[PDB]
Amino acid sequence: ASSTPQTNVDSMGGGQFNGQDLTFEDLRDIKDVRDSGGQVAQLMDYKALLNFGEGCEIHVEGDDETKQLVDGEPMTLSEWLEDAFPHLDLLVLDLGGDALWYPYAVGEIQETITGEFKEALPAEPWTLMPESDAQGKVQAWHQRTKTHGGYQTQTLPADDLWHIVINKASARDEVGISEVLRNKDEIQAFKQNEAAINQAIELHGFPQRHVKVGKEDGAPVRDNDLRRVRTIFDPRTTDANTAYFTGQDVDVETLEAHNFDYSAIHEMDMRNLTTALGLPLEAGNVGADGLGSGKPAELRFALLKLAIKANQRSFSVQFVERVMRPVVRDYSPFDHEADIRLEINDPLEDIGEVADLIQQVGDYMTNEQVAEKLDLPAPEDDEVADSYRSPADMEKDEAGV
Amino acid sequence: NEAAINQAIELHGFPQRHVKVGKEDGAPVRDNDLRRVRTIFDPRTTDANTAYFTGQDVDVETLEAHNFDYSAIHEMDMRNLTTALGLPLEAGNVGADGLGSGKPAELRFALLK
Amino acid sequence: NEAAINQAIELHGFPQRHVKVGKEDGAPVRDNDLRRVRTIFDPRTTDANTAYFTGQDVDVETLEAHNFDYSAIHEMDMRNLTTALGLPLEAGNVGADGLGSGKPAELRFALLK
Amino acid sequence: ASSTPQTNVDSMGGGHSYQFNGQDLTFEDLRDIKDVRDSGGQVAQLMDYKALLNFGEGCEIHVEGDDETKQLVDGEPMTLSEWLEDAFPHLDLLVLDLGGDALWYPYAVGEIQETITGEFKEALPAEPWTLMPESDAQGKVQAWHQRTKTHGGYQTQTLPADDLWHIVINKASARDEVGISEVLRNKDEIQAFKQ
Amino acid sequence: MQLRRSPGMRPMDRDWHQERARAREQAYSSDLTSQFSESEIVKYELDTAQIDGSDNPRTYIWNRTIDLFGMNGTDVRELRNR
Amino acid sequence: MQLRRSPGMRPMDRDWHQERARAREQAYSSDLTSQFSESEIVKYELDTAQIDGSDNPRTYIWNRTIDLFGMNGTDVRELRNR
Amino acid sequence: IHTILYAPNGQDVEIKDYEDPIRDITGVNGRLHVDCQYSQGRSSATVQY
Amino acid sequence: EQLLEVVMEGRELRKVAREASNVINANTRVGDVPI
Amino acid sequence: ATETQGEHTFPVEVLISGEELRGYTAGEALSAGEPVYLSGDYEVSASSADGGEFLGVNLYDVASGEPVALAGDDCEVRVEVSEQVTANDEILPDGLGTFETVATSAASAGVAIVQEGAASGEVCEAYIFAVQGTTA
Amino acid sequence: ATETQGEHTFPVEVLISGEELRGYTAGEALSAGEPVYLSGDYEVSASSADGGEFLGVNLYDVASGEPVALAGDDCEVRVEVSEQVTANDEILPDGLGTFETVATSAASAGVAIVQEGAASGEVCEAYIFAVQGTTA
Amino acid sequence: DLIERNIQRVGASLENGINRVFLTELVDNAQNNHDTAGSNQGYQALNSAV
Ligand SMILES: [K+]
Ligand SMILES: [K+]
Ligand SMILES: [Mg+2]
Ligand SMILES: [Mg+2]
Ligand SMILES: [Mg+2]
Ligand SMILES: [Mg+2]
Ligand SMILES: [Mg+2]
Ligand SMILES: [Mg+2]
Ligand SMILES: [Mg+2]
Ligand SMILES: [Mg+2]
């Protein structure tokens, strides 16, 4: 075959930006949706919390065989990585959040003054856009940031930043897609109907008093005269005790509240928006008939868990490849070609279903496997960890026999 | 149908105030005159508990919200589209009666699998 | 029947505004006169909470959405098509009352198998 | 790589005077949050329920290999966990009070204090609406500016970002050191409710 | 003894405050006779309120006959340079 | 500045295409004055659309006064010899 | 002696920068509404030369 | 039915100055090169 | 007015710069770039040949009775002149849908000043600085 | 034009208010606050005396052939006068780079109205309200 | 940074305005006055005004 890509990739721009598939203005538009708050922002925050809020675990295949003296004390690569990234649960939630809002999460590697590794430091994603070659790979990062009354702009090489893409146009898409911009029309439709409802509730949601003065086909009443009537019937001064006395030629009519189904409009908006963002309708505080139980429920929660799994896999691989491996290679005594995996926890596990499973089929699982499913530390003794019958069952025999 | 619904909701989903001025078969009201009436009844500065005082020859009518079942149209569109793409209806956040349980549920899930 | 429903939804599924101009048995209104009225009530530039001020001789009527049970027509079409193809009704995302459980379900699934 | 960040952080503003900056928040914006907090009703109770959910159930201190820390502190053995539980006796109340204030305001903020002998006293909190940070061009907080009411006007003073500490729950970005008030983020929704 | 309408009590009455605020937002000019009932002028001492039309929002809102650009309803005291 | 009606912008407008198609489908002749308003002719530049009646489906549809064979509505450009 | 400050938005002085992208100018504008009034002018004495 | 949602390009001029000369990214709008 | 590029004729963008846009009703059919004047209450029609009839220039082709966008004074506009003109010439509606110079007209004062000269039957660029009405 | 504070002289900011700021080529060297008129296609030069030659005032010093920004006839400006002026005086270019009154000029109409009075050689404040071109 | 300087000038200019409004009310509308008649200025005038 070949050692260089030979299909072209639809991406090398005519201008003197690298095509700017999104411009800095679009990135500020995403930031403006995010900072505006309300129902839209909360839905996209629920999306981040589902995908990344349940935290993480680091695995290495043959981790025990990595045992090495790091600083007199022995460590495995997993132990070293867990010390290199102490707060990875927060970082995964932060980067995973950004990589759903924006086309990418992006950042620097950082060092102590002594030149030991400090952190992977995220950078504000709306401030940065990538510039990329004829085979679609990012070669430079162009950064525009606010300053008093204007902007500062700089360019940095792809050599020393890192970036992660969750949503892609193609498997070759190294730049990614914003789910906000992908669904901007549904966001606009939601927000405009929200404003339309609010204004209609003020005008039409409450009855209004209409006093008509004078006899029909009788003497005309002028503005001067209505001012005196207005003083008598003024709502600002009226109460539940108030009664009125009049001649026959004064009529107190009412503009009724003119009913319209704003609840149905909200539910339609929320259905359109939640479905567009791939969330179940229930996330929007809206219910539905024939969808709350049985296989109709189980499908939508399966579709949700599949979407979460797909995003998690996409994020995990890129974090290991673009962040962890360079850090192992450049600041660690261990082999960077070791088989590192980052798992991210399933947000929707029922521990009671796991416990039921363990009761039913634990007789076919090692005590290590049971500890993994149960989310506990594996046993200290490798023999009891490796064995299939319970550690409590081995203890009662080892003591009792 | 999504576009048609969205446009229809704007035009028909909300009531609109229709002030009629003058007596039927009486003196005509010209454009200049309606501008001053508009100034009194303008929704932009009206509030929820504003009250009106008039002679007998001003009528505050309402264009009601003209009801139509856009929910049924959305469900119908979703039923057509999901079945055309071979998905179960429930993937569209739309439910159906009788289909939610028993052998009817077993079948649609067997077809999907 | 799918084509007939889809066309009927466009014509009849949504209400349509009908502005009637001029007094009944009064002065006639010509096309070039209606062009100026069309400019005011234009649904293109109208918004959800627009308000109108008029003399007594302008009426904003409505073509309501004229109800028809297209859901029942789709269900009947699907009932024909599925049975003609020998599929169970549930394959069409329709289903039926009293048929989802007990010996009625056992029979239809026996016939299918 | 580098021992300082080379990416910039979007966040200049103000100086001594007020600016409608958007990245910064003024003492007025902070006292608006104070007013939503103390004016009561359904809005206040919902945000109090939010604080009680996040921080009301109390806390536990853990140290990995705590037993290995066994040391004579004052003619008596302790572990680090035992020492910390003596250093912070009522940490559950502090967690609820700071955690609540960090949901209301952009941050909780406070001092470290010493006994006269110089041993640790407490992590005394500070009234968050009284204080705002000053931050550099690369993103760190460098000083804290404090405005406090006195008899129809104000005192004002500045403190280094050294002997204070601060905590941010809600952030504009993963690189944000100043944070967001969920109240001011949703001010329009709150006024829509009240109207 | 003092009643709500009595001259020494007017500044205690919530309504005297609220209604003087209303009166300032209603007016287009200082001519009270053109705009207010003679009851209101006495009851709320509208001679002493700085009524002049400068507080009425409608003084500042644009309302042209034809609007192709969505200019109507903007308030000039909310522009950039105001 | 360019408005939606401005002459340099008309080809970008979705409505300008859609209503020119509508006019082609709806005419019986090239004689615009007898068929369209001055508004339609100006707004949609109908002089420049190839309007002649040849794209109106009703040009080709049988519309016989007495229809024994139930044959009205048939379109000649769908016959096998076309 | 009372310094009465008024703002339609917020409470204090309102100072804003804005950009004109037609002219490439930053404008910086400040506004405030203020009046000052005694509640008891008897509570002050001036010293006169 | 849907439109031809396309636009044909006009004439495009040749752009070379940025390659065909020494480019200075100046710090100031006005300046000097010493000779 | 129109520009030629190969086979193609392009309409010129009338309004170069300008903050001053207002909507009127057409008193007659009008075309883009015509000078116009008040002919009834908010009603606008084509300017006649000399002074006293100018409010602005029409921005798009209209049938009679349609809403019209004008570019007013304070606008810079691309307009056809019926006469050869030079920078600093004051120009005036010609009565023929073009402008002409004040010097050619019977009037003493213009409505727009030429910034960019043009031949007869050709597009100049001009700044509109005044309106003219009935003074008697 | 300059302002003194203690030992120091400061440049006067020409523009007080307004947004009608427009770009031309300088036909000669020009100085801040100087009145100018169209000398060629989008080119401006210093106004002569007695009318027919004013488009605006030059906002900053420029050499010949440089692009120049100009305050037009909606702007409010600080400008130097050759004679004493008072509020409500109409003024127009001197030919000397300053302004004088319509009262002293051979012209009959001004281009700016004086809002704050000034002595000969001082800076007045004026609102520019018209432009003047070639009428013949 | 000219924008920081201009924010500072605008803020100073508003504060100077407040101070003018304040001092003018304060001086003009005081209901008491110690006239020193060009004599015993300083502490005795200040005590007399109290
Ligand atoms: K002539
Ligand atoms: K002279
Ligand atoms: Mg009578
Ligand atoms: Mg009559
Ligand atoms: Mg008749
Ligand atoms: Mg030099
Ligand atoms: Mg101005
Ligand atoms: Mg301009
Ligand atoms: Mg002007
Ligand atoms: Mg006294």
Residue numbers in the entry:
A (entry chain PK): 31 to 45, 49 to 434
B (entry chain PL), C (entry chain PA): 226 to 338
D (entry chain PJ): 31 to 225
E (entry chain P5), F (entry chain P6): 1 to 82
G (entry chain JA): 348 to 396
H (entry chain KF): 115 to 149
I (entry chain JK), J (entry chain JI): 2 to 137
K (entry chain JA): 199 to 248
Extract from the study:
The portal is a dodecamer of gp13 (PP), which spans the capsid through one pentagonal vertex. We found that the symmetry mismatch between the MCP pentamer and the PP dodecamer is interfaced by the intermediary portal interface protein gp21 (PIP). A pentameric ring of gp21 (portal interface protein, PIP, brown) integrates the portal 12-mer into the fivefold vertex of the capsid. Around the portal, the conformation of MCP is again different from those found in the trimers, to accommodate the capsid-portal interface. At the portal-capsid interface, one of the MCP-bound magnesium ions is replaced by an arginine of PIP. In addition, PIP also has a putative phosphohistidine residue at position 17, which forms a stabilising H-bond with neighboring MCP monomer. Similarity, but no definite homology, could be determined for the HTC, and the PIP had no hits for structural similarity whatsoever, suggesting that this part of the capsid has a unique origin.
